[PDB]
Amino acid sequence: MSNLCADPEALVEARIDEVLTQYRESPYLLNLIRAYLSKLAETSMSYCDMVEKFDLDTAVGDQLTIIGRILGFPRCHCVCDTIPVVGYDCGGSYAGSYQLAGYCEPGSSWIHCSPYGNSELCVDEDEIYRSLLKARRYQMLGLYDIESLHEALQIVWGEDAMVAETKVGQVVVTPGRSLTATETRYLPIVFRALPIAPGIKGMIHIDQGPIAGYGDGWAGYCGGDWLCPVDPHAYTCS
Amino acid sequence: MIELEVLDESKQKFSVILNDRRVTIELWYNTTNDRWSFSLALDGDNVVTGRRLVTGVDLLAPFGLGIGALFLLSENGEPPTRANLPLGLVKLYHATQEEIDAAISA
Amino acid sequence: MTYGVQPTGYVKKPLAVHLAEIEASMVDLFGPGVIQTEQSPLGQLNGLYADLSYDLDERGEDLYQSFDPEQAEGSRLDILARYRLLSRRAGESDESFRRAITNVDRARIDLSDLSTALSAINGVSWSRVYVNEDATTDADGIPPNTVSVAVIGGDDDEVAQLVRRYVVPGVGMYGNTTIETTIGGFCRRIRVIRPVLIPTSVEIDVQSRPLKNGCPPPSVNAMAAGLYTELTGPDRPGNGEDGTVYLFRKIMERLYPNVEVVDVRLSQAPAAPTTPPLVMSFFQMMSFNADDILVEIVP
Amino acid sequence: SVEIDVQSRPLKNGCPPPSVNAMAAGLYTELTGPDRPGNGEDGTVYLFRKIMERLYPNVEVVDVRLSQAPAAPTTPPLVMSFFQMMSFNADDILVEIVP
Amino acid sequence: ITNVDRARIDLSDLSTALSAINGVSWSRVYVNEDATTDADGIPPNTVSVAVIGGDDDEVAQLVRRYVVPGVGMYGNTTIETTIGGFCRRIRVIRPVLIPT
Numbered sequence A: 001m002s003n004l005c006a007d008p009e010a011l012v013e014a015r016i017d018e019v020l021t022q023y024r025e026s027p028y029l030l031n032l033i034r035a036y037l038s039k040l041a042e043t044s045m046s047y048c049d050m051v052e053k054f055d056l057d058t059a060v061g062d063q064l065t066i067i068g069r070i071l072g073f074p075r076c077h078c079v080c081d082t083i084p085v086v087g088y089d090c091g092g093s094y095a096g097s098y099q100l101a102g103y104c105e106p107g108s109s110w111i112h113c114s115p116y117g118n119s120e121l122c123v124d125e126d127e128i129y130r131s132l133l134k135a136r137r138y139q140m141l142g143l144y145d146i147e148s149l150h151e152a153l154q155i156v157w158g159e160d161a162m163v164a165e166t167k168v169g170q171v172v173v174t175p176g177r178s179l180t181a182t183e184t185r186y187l188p189i190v191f192r193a194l195p196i197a198p199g200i201k202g203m204i205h206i207d208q209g210p211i212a213g214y215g216d217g218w219a220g221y222c223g224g225d226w227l228c229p230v231d232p233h234a235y236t237c238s
Numbered sequence B: 001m002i003e004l005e006v007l008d009e010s011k012q013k014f015s016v017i018l019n020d021r022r023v024t025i026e027l028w029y030n031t032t033n034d035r036w037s038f039s040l041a042l043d044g045d046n047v048v049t050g051r052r053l054v055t056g057v058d059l060l061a062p063f064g065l066g067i068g069a070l071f072l073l074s075e076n077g078e079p080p081t082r083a084n085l086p087l088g089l090v091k092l093y094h095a096t097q098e099e100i101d102a103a104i105s106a
Numbered sequence C: 001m002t003y004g005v006q007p008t009g010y011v012k013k014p015l016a017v018h019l020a021e022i023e024a025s026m027v028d029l030f031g032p033g034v035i036q037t038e039q040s041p042l043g044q045l046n047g048l049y050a051d052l053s054y055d056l057d058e059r060g061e062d063l064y065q066s067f068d069p070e071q072a073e074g075s076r077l078d079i080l081a082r083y084r085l086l087s088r089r090a091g092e093s094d095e096s097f098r099r100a101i102t103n104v105d106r107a108r109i110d111l112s113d114l115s116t117a118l119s120a121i122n123g124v125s126w127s128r129v130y131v132n133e134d135a136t137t138d139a140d141g142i143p144p145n146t147v148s149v150a151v152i153g154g155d156d157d158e159v160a161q162l163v164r165r166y167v168v169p170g171v172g173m174y175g176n177t178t179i180e181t182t183i184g185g186f187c188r189r190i191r192v193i194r195p196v197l198i199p200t201s202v203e204i205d206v207q208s209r210p211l212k213n214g215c216p217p218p219s220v221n222a223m224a225a226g227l228y229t230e231l232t233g234p235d236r237p238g239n240g241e242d243g244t245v246y247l248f249r250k251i252m253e254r255l256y257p258n259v260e261v262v263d264v265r266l267s268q269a270p271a272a273p274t275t276p277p278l279v280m281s282f283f284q285m286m287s288f289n290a291d292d293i294l295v296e297i298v299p
Numbered sequence D: 001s002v003e004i005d006v007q008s009r010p011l012k013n014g015c016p017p018p019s020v021n022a023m024a025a026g027l028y029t030e031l032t033g034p035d036r037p038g039n040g041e042d043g044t045v046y047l048f049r050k051i052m053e054r055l056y057p058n059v060e061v062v063d064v065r066l067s068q069a070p071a072a073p074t075t076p077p078l079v080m081s082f083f084q085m086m087s088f089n090a091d092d093i094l095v096e097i098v099p
Numbered sequence E: 001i002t003n004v005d006r007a008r009i010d011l012s013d014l015s016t017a018l019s020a021i022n023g024v025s026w027s028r029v030y031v032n033e034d035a036t037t038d039a040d041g042i043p044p045n046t047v048s049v050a051v052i053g054g055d056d057d058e059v060a061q062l063v064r065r066y067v068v069p070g071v072g073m074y075g076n077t078t079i080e081t082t083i084g085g086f087c088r089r090i091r092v093i094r095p096v097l098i099p100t
Helices: A008-016 A027-049 A062-071 A126-141 A146-156 A181-193 B097-105 C015-030 C041-065 C075-081 C094-102 C112-120 C156-166 C220-232 C245-255 D020-032 D045-055 E012-019 E056-064
Strands: A076-078 A120-122 A162-166 A170-174 A201-205 B002-004 B011-018 B021-030 B035-042 B045-052 B069-074 B090-095 C004-006 C009-011 C126-132 C146-152 C172-174 C177-183 C186-192 C196-208 C259-268 C284-287 C294-297 D002-008 D059-066 D093-097 E026-032 E046-052 E077-081 E088-092
Touching: A008 A027, A027 C004, A027 C015, A027 C041, A062 A126, A062 C094, A076 A181, A120 A181, A126 A146, A126 A181, A146 A162, A146 A170, A181 A201, B090 B097, C009 C041, C015 C041, C075 C094, C112 C126, C112 C146, C112 C156, C146 C156, C146 C186, C156 C177, C156 C186, C172 C186, C196 C220, C196 C245, C220 C245, C220 C294, C245 C259, C245 D045, D002 D020, D002 D045, D020 D045, D020 D093, D045 D059, E012 E026, E012 E046, E012 E056, E046 E056, E046 E088, E056 E077, E056 E088
Parallel strands: A170 A201, C146 C172, C196 C284, C196 C294, D002 D093
Antiparallel strands: A076 A120, A162 A170, B002 B090, B011 B021, B021 B035, B035 B045, B069 B090, C004 C009, C126 C146, C177 C186, C196 C259, D002 D059, E026 E046, E077 E088
């Protein structure tokens, strides 16, 4: 569409124009009416901030959670992983049985959190959950071909990502770059969102670097590496 | 299929027997967005309320009411307007499910 | 602008805030000498219009929640699900359809489209989807790179036309029932599981453990009726699930925490109950009767 | 001091074995919250297995060991008198999976 | 209303409330406020209720709001009640009718 609403003063003046001649120059009456109507107009302006807060390319927070709930990919998932816990390691080091967080960790969770006491790793950084939803809208439509899987991987990981092999029931992918800790920890959730046909096992390159070999779009000596598909353990501990 | 006449009034209401059901339709014009909207009541109960009249799609598809398709058409795909809907430049049509099936098969 | 649509949701301006800034607008107009007490002519007007502004905020919250499957309800919930072309079943509740839209965990998000469309098929009482995506046959007997479907009810034609369009070519299917399907002349045999029901006889011994001597245990008939409901519900034991002491001790104690399960006994009817485990194969299922369930309290 | 040894029983289409830390923190929060074991409530296998199997339906409890800090964990029952009450610490709960 | 001579000015409220339940054809209230058991078998500091007819649920909930905690009840039929979760067990006497 286009601009839904207008400035409140435009609407209120449009209405003040309808006043009677005998009141056209009553500054106290007109200013009282303006005071009372300018708030209704201002209150309702807050609604045109309900228009692009759900834009998948820009949504954040609860607006992104609601889109995730529409697309059927919640923010958090069960895993076989020791999520980092917010807390102090008794200074230098303490024996304990947990691992700790330090003000910059997507694995933010307190030991008392409900989506932590039952092993739900919850995705907090919007830039990664947005990518997961942009990939999930491919599982939605069942676009399992390479032309679509490569496009999904570009959004998840970057322009260097690629899909390598198509064995019997086993497909390898690579980000094409060293991953950071946040991306490594979220990796199991990425293979739950990628468009890979059920009954076919997704794998991952070891070094997350571009694959080598012969052909047109590949990597040579500098930049490439020998393939090695490994199990990301997206659904199992084993 | 049938054509449903629209009067030159910003709010109008009528009743028609669709698939042997008494369907009451209420059209009202929203000046702020310059668009027509419809509420539909099946046998006295409002099943659809506040839907935007848009050309070229089945307006009743999401609801599974079982009363066929209700759709708007125009020669060059113009959008419905206060002036252009009552003039017959945009026509409201009801199509029965069997007719839709026969056309789809043909 | 902390109010309105915020990263935490829709933040609502309090009525007191509305009234206070109405009063600020009126002080800026009439001067500091104005009277605005809640019982004066100007105070009453301020209250009325503060209420109207707050009701506009209420509308804003309604409009925001009309796009959250957790708050949307009715035909608007149906339109929301129309983004993924899910459909509500007959008599399905908003809570159930909402859980289907959201895909609450499910621990494996894919195969959710197939699972939900199967459930939507008319007549399908119980449905379940399995997959063997490794290069080895799993302990349940599913060959590698295979999709298995278990379904009770529904016509084979609709079931198979759905399963064919949800499972890609080049992926097999493990099952006991075969359905021949045709599209454009191409001829796929879709194998599904129609689990064979084994009438199970179940006899349970329980001890009473009142919570802080809080309230005493219920009656034997009530506990047996609860267990029959639990085992006949949508969370009934699946195919290939052997009857064990653990399963029933997990069901009884959850249904009635003040009761300790001591000894479970199972058998295939009409055979006498005995020691578990009762082994069901992957094509078999446990089927229960109200009469067969028996519960006894022991000292 | 409390110690639970469990066997994972994952239904085919379900989450994997939940992590030991998550299992420990879930038991800790539920034993520390309003539904904590009250005074004069003997620590016993019934209570802990009930709690664990209610939290994690895909887990079977093999055994419970209980004692007082620093005393070595002992087979239940852990007798508490009507005036004595059990206390717990997050770092004093240990969960492990048995094969 | 007047509490015509009863010899127990308290307990008349409970007696009246019991008789006011639907279906209660006969009712009576007994007490042993002494520290020793009476020859009738009522333990010390005990309030007993005898009643014929009326639903157990309503009878027990009514007796509960008249008999205070810390006071026992002697009877042959036990009914389990609940207010706010604090389930109690209220014992009353359902007389056995012996034809004569």
